[PDB]
Design a protein around this ligand. Structure first.
Ligand SMILES: Nc1nc2c(ncn2[C@@H]2O[C@H](COP(=O)(O)OP(=O)(O)OP(=O)(O)O)[C@@H](O)[C@H]2O)c(=O)[nH]1
Length: 292
């Protein structure tokens, strides 16, 4: 039982992208203060709660409504945009409740763009520290590093939809590996071994389609701009290899071995594969490195 919880406006929009893109392994929950924007959410479960301190007390006042929604989950994803009042303060509370209930809590959050001002960057920094305390592992993508990812052509009014896509890839990276119906999935106990109480995590994404797509997508994930460091400093590595119906076990093994050779000699590496047939010839390699 996996649940991804979008906290705040930006977090809700990512969840809505997470649903438009096929991701049915998981139960979706949306939490916000703005009721109208909650009605425009696509998640099954919606919870209205109620400067990042309003968000906090709103979440704490709705502790039991949040507790009820998460009930039964084994792992929970809390995705939010840090910076605003709602997500920055409420998302650490939703995470801390999830971790108290025994769920493996994974935070996938964003730092705002530089063009959003220092105050929004200052509050986001405090939210990030709050979330690190709350979750098992936290993935933080600074929105500024999408400029090292997006096209020269990217419109400025499209900028927050690429943020949605990156948060989609963070959650779907791990979520697709654990409970899809086509079961060459991994074992949950081993996932816990890589995520539990670790803290700060890196994410690498690589896409390719050639004859040597496996080697190419793995090298590009190893050196994805989203990684702030090389994964060599990492103790545990969770790797996802998503392909179409032509994805081979050899290709997965090849890509896993390339990543494992870049990690620390005695990393704890677990990897799995996901067949999604909308993808034709391109494979996507997602690497999650933990413990920093
Ligand atoms: N991925 C994504 N991020 C967004 C989006 N909109 C804003 N963000 C980022 O997330 C940060 C917080 O924005 P919101 O989530 O809308 O703020 P909030 O949580 O609703 O808090 P409030 O101020 O009470 O509305 C902003 O600084 C942006 O950097 C979005 O649509 N998608």
């Amino acid at each position: 039982t996996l649940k991804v919880i979008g906290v705040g406006g930006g977090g809700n929009n990512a969840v809505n992208r997470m649903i438009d893109h096929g991701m049915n392994n998981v139960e979706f929950i949306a939490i916000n203060t703005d009721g109208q924007a909650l009605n425009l959410s696509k998640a099954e479960s919606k919870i209205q709660i109620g400067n990042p301190e309003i968000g906090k007390k709103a979440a704490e006042e709705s502790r039991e409504q949040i507790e009820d929604a998460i009930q039964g989950a084994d792992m929970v994803f809390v995705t939010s945009g840090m910076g605003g009042g709602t997500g920055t303060g409420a998302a650490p509370v939703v995470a801390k409740i999830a971790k108290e209930m025994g769920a493996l809590t994974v935070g996938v959050v964003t730092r705002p763009f530089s063009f959003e001002g220092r105050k929004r960057q200052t509050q986001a920094a405090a939210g990030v520290e709050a979330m690190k305390a709350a979750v098992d592992t936290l993935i933080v993508i600074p929105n500024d590093r999408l400029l090292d990812i997006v096209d020269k052509s990217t419109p400025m009014m499209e900028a927050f939809k690429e943020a949605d896509n990156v948060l989609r890839q963070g959650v779907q990276g791990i979520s697709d590996l654990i409970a899809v119906s086509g079961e060459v999935n991994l074992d949950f106990a081993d996932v816990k071994t890589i995520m539990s109480n670790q803290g700060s995590a890196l994410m690498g994404i690589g896409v390719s389609s050639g004859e040597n797509r496996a080697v190419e997508a793995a090298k590009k994930a190893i050196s994805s701009p989203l990684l702030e460091t090389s994964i060599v400093g990492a103790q545990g590595v969770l790797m996802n290899i998503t392909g179409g119906e032509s994805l081979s076990l050899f290709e997965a093994q090849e890509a896993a071995d390339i990543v494992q050779d870049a990690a620390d000699e005695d990393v704890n590496m677990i990897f799995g594969t996901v067949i999604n047939p909308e993808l034709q010839d391109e494979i996507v390699v997602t690497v999650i490195a933990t413990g920093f």
